[PDB]
Structures are given as C-alpha cells and as structure tokens.
Amino acid sequence: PRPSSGELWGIHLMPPRILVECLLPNGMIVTLECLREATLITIKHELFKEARKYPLHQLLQDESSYIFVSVTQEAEREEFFDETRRLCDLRLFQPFLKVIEPVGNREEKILNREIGFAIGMPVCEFDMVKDPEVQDFRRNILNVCKEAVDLRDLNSPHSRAMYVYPPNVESSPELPKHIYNKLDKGQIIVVIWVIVSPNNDKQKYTLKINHDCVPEQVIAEAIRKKTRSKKLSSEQLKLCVLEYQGKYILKVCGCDEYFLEKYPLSQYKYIRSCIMLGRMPNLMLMAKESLYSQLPMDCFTMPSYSRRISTSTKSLWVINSALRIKILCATYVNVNIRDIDKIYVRTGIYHGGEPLCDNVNTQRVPCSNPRWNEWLNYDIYIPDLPRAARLCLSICSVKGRKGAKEEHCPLAWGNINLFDYTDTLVSGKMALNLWPVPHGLEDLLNPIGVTGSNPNKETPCLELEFDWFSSVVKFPDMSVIEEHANWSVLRENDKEQLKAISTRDPLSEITEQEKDFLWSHRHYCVTIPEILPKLLLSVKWNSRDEVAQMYCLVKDWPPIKPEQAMELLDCNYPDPMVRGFAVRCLEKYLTDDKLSQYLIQLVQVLKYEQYLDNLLVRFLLKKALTNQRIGHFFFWHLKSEMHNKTVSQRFGLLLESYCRACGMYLKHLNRQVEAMEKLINLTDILKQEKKDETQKVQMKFLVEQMRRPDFMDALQGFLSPLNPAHQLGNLRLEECRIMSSAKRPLWLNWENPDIMSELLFQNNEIIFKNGDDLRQDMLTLQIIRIMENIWQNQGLDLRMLPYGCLSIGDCVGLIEVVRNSHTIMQIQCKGQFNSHTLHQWLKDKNKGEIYDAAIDLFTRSCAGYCVATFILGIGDRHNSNIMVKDDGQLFHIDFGHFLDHKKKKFGYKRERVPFVLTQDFLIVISKGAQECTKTREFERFQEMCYKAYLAIRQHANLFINLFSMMLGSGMPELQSFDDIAYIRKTLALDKTEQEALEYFMKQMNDAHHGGWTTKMDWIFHTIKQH
Amino acid sequence: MSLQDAEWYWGDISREEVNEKLRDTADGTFLVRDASTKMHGDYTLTLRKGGNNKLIKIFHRDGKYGFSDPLTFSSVVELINHYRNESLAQYNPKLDVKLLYPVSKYQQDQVVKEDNIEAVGKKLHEYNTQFQEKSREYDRLYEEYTRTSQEIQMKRTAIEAFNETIKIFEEQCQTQERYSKEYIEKFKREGNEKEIQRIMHNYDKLKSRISEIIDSRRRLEEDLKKQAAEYREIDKRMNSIKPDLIQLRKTRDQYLMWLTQKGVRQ
Ligand SMILES: Cc1nc(NC(=O)N2CCC[C@H]2C(N)=O)sc1-c1ccnc(C(C)(C)C(F)(F)F)c1
Ligand code: NA
After folding, report:
1. Which residues of A touch B162 (CB under 8 A)?
2. Using a CB-CB distance cutoff of 8 angstroms, which residues of chain B are in contact with residue A26?
3. Do B105 and B231 share a structural domain?
4. Which residues carry this modification: Phosphotyrosine (chain B)?
5. Helix B117-189 to helix B193-261 angle, to the nearest 10 degrees?
6. In this structure, are B129 and B250 located in the same domain?
7. Which of B30, B48, B172 would you mutate first to test chain A, the one with the most A CBs within 10 A?
8. Phi, psi angle pair for A732, to nearest 5°
C-alpha cells in the first residue's frame, strides 16, 4: 500500500548520486552519474564532454544548441528551458533526459509550464478536451482577463500599487462607541518611523491626530513636527506641506500592508485594532518612488488558443408534448448478487432542490443484466420546463428480505442539464459515466451534486435517449418571455403580514397559504424588496406562466443587501436571471472587505452553477484580478480542491485564466507551491517509510534534510500562504521540529526580513499538517471571525482568536501558531493541581496593576467562546483543546466537529453546551471569590453572554446563508439543510427573541447546574435590580 | 374525535422528522403535528403532493379550526376526516389531491415488541452496541475505498507516463537506425571492425533498456488489474453494509424513542 509521490516515481528522495540515461540527437545513449542537486547546465556540460567518447560524435552541435526534454510525473513531455533548475526538482518520472533542439513559441511554452505548475496540472490537457463548452470558456473568459488588466495599468503606478497592496480596511468609517471612547478627545497617538540615510537609522516621531485623518494628512502632520524646529513662514510651510505631502506613502511596521488610499485612518484594520487594544500603531514613512520602483510590470498576452479556427430551429414553447425520457442500459454495477434482489434507475426533474413533478422509476431488473429500454413519462409539459431544469438520476439496489420491508440503496448517481449553455434542449442518445455516492448521503438522488459525466471512464456508464422534435429546440428569447407576461392580464393587514414574513430566516417554514398570499400580492412585494427570496420560493417553477411573470418582476427589482443577495446564489436558486440579479447586487454593494470575509462560500457556490460561463464566475475572477489579496485566497481555495474530480475541470479552467492574467504574482504563488510540495514530500517520508522509528531518529532525519541546498532554496524567501503580507525569510532551523501529535505535524519558524520586524511580527511560526482535513476547522474559524466582527460593530468587545487556518490540498494544511499560549492541561501540569491552579498561574503571569486587565480579557474571551461554541455546537471542550495566553486571552483550538454530528450516531435529541465553565474558570472570572456565581463579576459575564447571543441571533440570516452555500462542498458534517437545522434550534429562530434568551439561559443552567440568574422580571424582561 | 388518539396526530416531532417519514412516499400521504412555533393550539398539516411536502397551517381561533377564512370545523379530527373522504378543492380552487394515506404511529410501535422498560433497555443496548460497531467498520471500509481510489488514479497516470517514455526510447532506436545505417556501410569499407561493435553495443544497450521499461510497465498493468478488482470488492461490501446500517440506526432510534415514551416526562 505505498506508491511514492517524490523526486521520481516510486521514490520519495533521489539518493545523493543517481544514474541518468541521456538520449543524444544522434541516437546514442549515454549513462551519466549525476549529483541529485546538480543543475541542468552542469549535467548538460558533463554530458557533452562525455559524448566525445561515443560513436557518431561529429553529428552533435554546440551544447548551447540544445536543451533537455523528458517525461514528468504528470505524464507530460516537458522541455526544460530554465537550465538553472536542479535535477531533483524536475519531477521526472524516470531518470532519463532527451537532447533536443528547442522549437516553437518559447515564451508561451515557459508561461504555460509556470501556469501548469501553479495549478497542479499540465495545461495541454485543456487543448485536448472535445467539449464545446470548455473551449468556449477558455476563449470568452479572456475578455474578463483583458478587462481587468487594462483597468490595472490605467492610472499607473498608483493603480498598480493599489492592485498589489490594497487597503486593508473595515467596510464603514463609523466608530462603535466602545472604540471611540478609547480615543483621547477623538484623537490617536501614532508613532511614525523613518529609515534615514546613509546608515539606515531608525528615527521615531510621535503624533497625536484626529482618528479620521486621511493618510495624506498624517504625512503632512509628520512634515509639520519635522520642520517645526526650523522656523518658517506658515505660507512657505504649508506650501512645503502641500508640495511634498504626496511624495511619501505610509506602511505598517513589520509586514507589507500599505495605506495607499484616502480612507480615514481608523478605518484601516490595523489602526482600528490598535485603538481597541490600546496598542501603539507603528507606521513607516517612505518615499512614494521607492515603492513604485518595487512594482513589477504586469503584461498580459493573448494565448494561442484565442487565435485558432473552430467549428432548422424551433422554440421550446411551440413543442406540444409531455416530457419523455428513455433509460436504455447501464454497463455494470458493483453489487453482491446474493445480498440484493433487483436493480433499477430512479429519476426526477429538478429545479434547484425541488422536484418539478414527482419522481419516476424504471422497472426492476436483475443485477447481472442492467437493461431497461424504458420510456419514462414525467408529468410536465415541455413548454412548462424552466430554464434551470435538471435531470437527476441514480442506479439503485433493492433488497426485499424482511417482511414487506425493503432496503433501497443508491449505487451511483448523475445529473444532467435539460438545456445546454447555448439554451439548446438536449436530444438524442447520451452516455453518462456516473459518480460514487457521497459519504453519509442516504437519499436515492443527489440533486445538489454537480452536473456532467464523470471524467473517469471506468465507472458505471448509463445510456440515455431524449426525445427528438425533428428540429433543434431552443429556449425562447427574453423578448418573447417578457411579452407573455403582459399576455396574462385588506391593505394594512396585508402590509404587516408581508413584512412579518420577510423578517424570518431563509429556512423558516413557508406554508402553502403564505405562498399563495405572497404570489397574489407579488406586485406590492416590491415595496419590501428583501422579501424576494421568499417570493421566489412561492413561484410555481413548473408553469411557464408564473415564471415569465416572475422574470418581469426581477428585471425591475430594487437591489438588496449582499448578505441577503447571497442566499440567491445558493443551491435553492438555480435560475440564471435570479442569480444574475444577485450578482449585480454584489457588484454594486459588496465591499472588498466583505468579499474577502465571504470568499470561501462564494467560491463554493460556483459548484452549483449549471455552466462554466456565468455572471458569478466573471465577477469573482474580475475581483481576483483587480485585488491581489483577494487573488491570493481565490487561488488557494481553488487549488486546494484540484484533487477532487467533481470540480477539477471547472476549477482548473478558472485557475488557468487567473494565472494568465494575474501578472507577477504567479512567480510568488509558484514559490509558495514549491515550498508546500517539499513539505508534503518530507512529511510523507516521515509518515510512510519512517513510520516506525523513534522521534530522535526522525528528528535527526528532519534536520539533515532541511540543511539541504535544494530545501533551503525552496523553503526560504517566499510569502506566507496564510497572510501573503507576511514575508518568510530564512528558516530558524533550531526552532523547527516534528510535533508529538499523531499525523506528525511540523512546527516551523522563519525570520521576518522586514527591517522593522522587532515592533511587530518578529516570529512567523506555522504548523504544517499533512493527513487531516482542515476544511471544517477553516470554516469554523471563519465563522468565529465573522461573529467577532458582528460584536465589535455592536460595541461588544469580546476578543475571539480566529487563528490562521488554511487548507491547501487534499487533507493538507497550515495553522498559524498563537504565541505565548498554553493549554489548560499544560497549565495544570506545572504548579498537584486543584481548581485554583489556573487562577494562580494567571496571577503569577500578571502581577500588580496589570492583574485586573488580564481578568477582564479572560472574562470577555470566555464569554465569546461560551456563546459561539453553544450556537455552532462545536465538539466537546476539554483541557487539551482549550488554550490561554499569558495575558489571559482564552480561545479554543481543534474544532473538527459541529452542528448535529452527535445526534446522527447517538440518536439523542438535545442541544449540548460544549463549553461548560468549570469551577476553574469561574474562579478566574470571580477573582478567586468563594462563591463564584454570586459576584458582580459573574453578573457582568452573564450579560456579556446574553448580549453576544442576541447579536448573532439578530444576524441569523447571514450565518444560515453562509452555511447553506457550503452544502455541495463535500463536508460530511454539512450535507443538507437538516444539518443547518441545528443552528435554527440553538438560535431559537422559531421562537420570539425574549423566548430565545430564556431558552439560552435555561441551557446554561441545565449544563452548569444552576447559577445563571436574571436582572429582569419574568414577565416584561425589564431592569428590576440596581 | 379524540385528537390525542388520532392516528395521524404526531404531536411535537420536528419538520425534519416528518420529512423522513414522507421521504419518497406517494401523493396523498399526510400527517398533522404541532406548529414549529409551539404556541399551544396551533397545528401544522403536512401533505405529500408531486414529490414535495406541503405545509398547511391549521388556524385555531374561538371554538373552530380551519385552513381558509371561514373556520367551518369545530375540531381538528373533523377537518382531517372531512378532507379524508374528498378532494382539497375547497381549501383552494386548485390542488384537489384529497387526503388518502395517513402516516400511522401504530405500525411503528409494532417494531418494539417488549412491554416492560427493562427488556426495551436491554435491546436498546444491543442494537446500539451493534450500531457503533457496524458504523466503525463501514468507516474503515470507506477509508480503504478512498485510499484505493487514489492509488488507482496514481497508477493510471504512471502507466501513461510509461507510454510516453517508451515511445521516446523507441524513437531513439529509429533515430539510431537512420544515422548509423550509412556509417556502418562506409565503416566496413574502411575496415574498422571494433568501431562497428561500439555502435552495435550502444544499440544493444538501448534495446535492452526498452525491454526493461516495457516489462516494468507490464508489471504495473498487472498491479492495476488486481487493485481495480479490490476496489470493486470494497464497493460491493459497502453496498451490502449500507442499507443494513440505515435500518439498524432507525431501529435503535425508535427504541430510544420508546424508552423515552414510557419513562418519566416533564
Ligand atoms: C493556534 C495554535 N497555537 C499554538 N501554540 C503553541 O502550541 N505554543 C505556543 C508556545 C508553546 C507552545 C505550547 N502551547 O506548547 S498550538 C495551535 C494549534 C491549533 C490547532 N491545532 C493544533 C494542533 C497541534 C492540534 C495541530 F492541529 F497542529 F496538530 C495546534
Ligand atoms: Na528583521
């Protein structure tokens, strides 16, 4: 069970010397012994020296007339134009090299290799593919690439700098009052640093300015304090300020983060963090030119595939027939003939998750002979088919053994668009290679699943035939549809109910009464534009009459909040107008801040798109190519899934266009990818060949490898995939180690090459982990961050710690290390532990005046995690998965389960309190009081929890939407809307807000065995006490 | 008449639970439950129509219950039986799917045989013990399935790579054949024998190399066939276990419900 992924096929690491077969242009073969780290310049030179000793030498040209070609592990024949590359880095399949004369388009060949390296797949594979939709995509998407690249060079250099180093800022300038009150008379002390010539001295100027100062104003203020010792006319002065105000730019000390834009200073996330923490902002001033010289020149070439030659019509609505589809035969199934009775094919016609008529089975036939030749009739009229209609099918097994009870299991599934991307109604025979059933999915179909034939061709193959109308049939154009709507043709009680329906959450039950009510009042519905998702679900999508009408409404519909618009991109809203509308909202109202925040989900709903080419993908790609911070994560989220064959054609096509237009960042991404690939190889050796060996032996092997020159080259001097603003310099080899945990994670440390790194970010410490699926943690951490943000904006300072977590591949990832923090178990194990050990530890770490602050920080942190883990239903906490910083911040690690996971395997219907505050925590919060729940401190902590809970509940739409967009994501714990039903329970969405709080209090009491009281009367919830 | 004793009145079960019971059922299948609002006296009717579960609110005010504006029915059981004989056309002009097949709770209490709380508790233990064991095995199988799927993908790529490699060594033969043909002819005429042998020696070296690579591919082709067979066998095993596992959970899940049922309640 051990095939190897490494420097060669079947070998992880080339031995220090290796024999390499060289094929000369004259036909001769020469075996050369090479150093595994030797470059191609060296190897070629040695080869041609040696080739003098072999027959037909005279027919060989100058060694500079040739390059090497060979077969790589991806089975591509690859020409090596860059001869500085080391042999061990070539990814050869076998150790041989062929000498050729370089031909063809050299720059394009080189670019394509760089692209293929980034995305994990040779781009020649794309040139192969026959599907019209694919080639159309690769061509048309180039429009988006050119649009962005032009919009980049427009304003140069500034617009190019804005692309590379975007403003990292909050979505609004407005300051919550807990933030504002931290300001001294609405003003902030900032320290501005300059590196002064010749000797690069660091000089410190301290300024007190208005929080809303534009960075240009901050620079003028520094100019004022600088030239103030010198006295001069206030006219020459502010002429001196004016003229030189824009000769400089500001940067954060320690990481590459810039303020290039006239946003208020407190709006930049770094400054806003400094304020809330009472930390000194430290900025570095530098000349605008020394930055704009750093900027690479990005140039975009049209690829050769944009230069190549390529290859009776009736309306859908004139076709008078019922829907009819033929199941012919399946090639094979894997079934145990003795354990199942018969097999058959389930089908359904779906718009989104909803059937447009009831499902239809073929007849049951023996396992051994999967043949039907059955025309299945559906109850719908072909003209009544909506544009997004899909065919959803499965081959199922049926076992009839126990009484009249049967067991139906899906063997394989597939989905088909009833219209293709040219709006052609599908017809004729069709062959569909099917897909494995997703782990945990018990339903006989999988309508959420992607459309299209499984690219693996040894799979069950199901032959179909659709009907033929003796013409090519197209979906009616918009002019036609628009017309048909015009061909169709209390109030205070109604208005209130309408609003009241619109205030509910997405997954709220909508009755048939309410759908008719909604549909009837649909024209007045425009007065409350955010009711749209609910009105859309009231529509009957199997009637062309109602859809045509709904289309005319959408055309003129007022935009809605992105947080709302995003629901329209989930798997429940397949219609191309509807999604278009949703995307135009994001275009108008979605800040880059929110786009970064929600990027995980927006990428995921791309899996739900019926076609490669759509408004959503164009918008995202465009954003990714005009903002490099968005571009970075855009790339890593797509690349991390490229192993998954359901999405890999789509994502690879998207990754190709992105890598063509992204510019010089491609060189940086490739350095990151190369660094991760050495970490994957290294940890694979540890987990495979070295799996039975001691830590000491393994630590000797890790050290000896990391000193290797090819390893140093690759792991030093690149940007961190967790935060590309963090530069990873030289390794600190002495702090690198294999952690004791089961999957053998690596603890890594890098110098921060930043000249100012002492002020902030002196260490970059990262855990590289191979073998666990990090997608669930990553989501959870993201949800925690979105929660923290919600609370801040309400003036609730609950300090969460959503540490960096990034999935880069199949079960491989990076975790950002939190400094100066230990687990509760680690704490108890130093300084014999009673319940008071923790509070004693926290005391020893904060002595004197700073003691109170540490308690305050531990209390707030505590509150936040108590509330969040309740709501999300995180896996149960213990002393190993809870951590505490020396200054008292508490946070959770290792989430790895959430929602309804426990109910599935234990069948208990309950809401857990995952984080139960043991006496140890109550002691800390109470500052060591004897009776901990009776202190005013603990009342304070309760009110925090209460506030935090209702804030999230008020935002329930957002969270529910975010989870809904993950349904097709492959996360076993979130497979359908039932998994999301959990947070509807913990947030008590079907109750009143006051009822919900009562419920939350009750959960806390049941879990903590009393001690959660109320400052309110039972009846009105009004302040009684104090 | 007794609504509590009604066959299709299921009380406080969640929407999800009703979904499970209505899963893939024929049109006309219905049950009534408490509203999700839990407001004491509102109930929600759930009707199966056209592959979809409808939700129909049952309005409770004064003395009478109903769908539409004119509360025409004095009790819940009145309404359901008066929609059980007829179509649904008088709630709405459209529809008219009636109410046909109910969901009974009594065929479900069939499956727990035992009366006392001790026998039920003992069987719950047994099922739940079997359940965690079978789950663990199905998960082990699914990892093996996954691992194997990947390894097969690796090997397929590696056979392709062998193909490309072999072509290239075969082209080298052909290239050698073209050049060396004219040289050995002329060389013979110039009487140099051991230079000819050097060319033939390199040609032997090339051809035996080709034989190695082809046989190494041959072996990998064998390994793939074997694994492809194991992968299908792991797929077979999973397809037997899966349906039995679902039914096992459903049994356990209602023994737990039964155990709750006669047992002290709030
Ligand atoms: C965010 C974070 N920060 C840390 N910091 C320290 O461990 N420190 C900090 C200094 C000493 C040392 C310690 N506590 O002894 S660990 C950590 C983390 C988060 C999530 N999972 C993990 C592991 C180890 C389970 C994983 F996944 F990598 F295997 C670690
Ligand atoms: Na430094």
Report:
1. 93
2. 175-176, 179
3. no
4. 142, 255
5. 170
6. yes
7. B172
8. -100, 105
Q: Is the dihedral of CA A959, A962, A968, A971 positive or negative?
A: negative
Say which amino acid occupies A746: L
- Last-in-domain residue among B109, B134, B156: B109
For this PDB entry, the determination method is: X-ray
**Single-letter amino acid, residue A397:** S
**Residue B178: closest CA among chain A residues belongs to which residue?**
A27
Whether B4 is covered by a domain: the verdict is no
Q: Are residues B103 and B233 in the same domain?
A: no
Q: How far apart are alpha carbons A571 and A605 in whole angstroms?
A: 7
The enclosing domain of B148 has a CATH number of 1.10.287.1490
Shortest-distance Cα residue to atom 23 of ligand 1: A894
**Three-state DSSP class for residue A375:** strand
Orientation angle between helical segments A478-486 and A544-555, nearest 10 degrees = 100
- From A1's Cα to the closest Cα of chain B, the distance in A is 8
Q: How big is the CA angle at A687 (ends A681 and A693), to the nearest 5 degrees?
A: 125
CA A61 to chain centre: 52
Nearest ligand to the C-alpha atom of residue A750: 2
| CB–CB contact B163 A75 (8 Å) | yes
CB A94 within 8 A of CB A9: yes
Residues B86 and B142 in one domain: no
CA–CA separation, A786 vs A808, rounded Å? 22
Residues A466, A564 within the same domain: no
Q: Which two structure tokens, joined as six digits, stand for B135?
A: 């789950």
- CA of B1 to nearest chain A CA: how many angstroms apart? 25
Q: Which domain holds residue B250?
A: 117-261
Is B44 among the domain residues? Answer: yes
Q: CA-to-CA distance for A938 and A1011, rounded, in angstroms?
A: 9
Resolution of this model in Å is 2.5
CATH code of the domain in which B63 resides: 3.30.505.10
Return the residue in A11, A19, A24, A28 with the most chain B beta carbons within 10 A, the one to mutate for interface testing: A28
CA dist A859 and A141 (Å) reads 51
Judge if A394 and A543 occupy the same domain: no
Structural domains of chain B, count: 2
Residues 227-256 of chain B with CB under 8 A from chain A are 228, 232, 235-237, 239-240, 242-244, 246-247, 249, 252-253, 256
Q: What is the CATH number of the domain that holds A404?
A: 2.60.40.150
Beta strands in chain B (DSSP E): 30-34, 43-49, 52-61, 64-66
Residues of B in contact with A23 (CB under 8 A): 168-169, 172
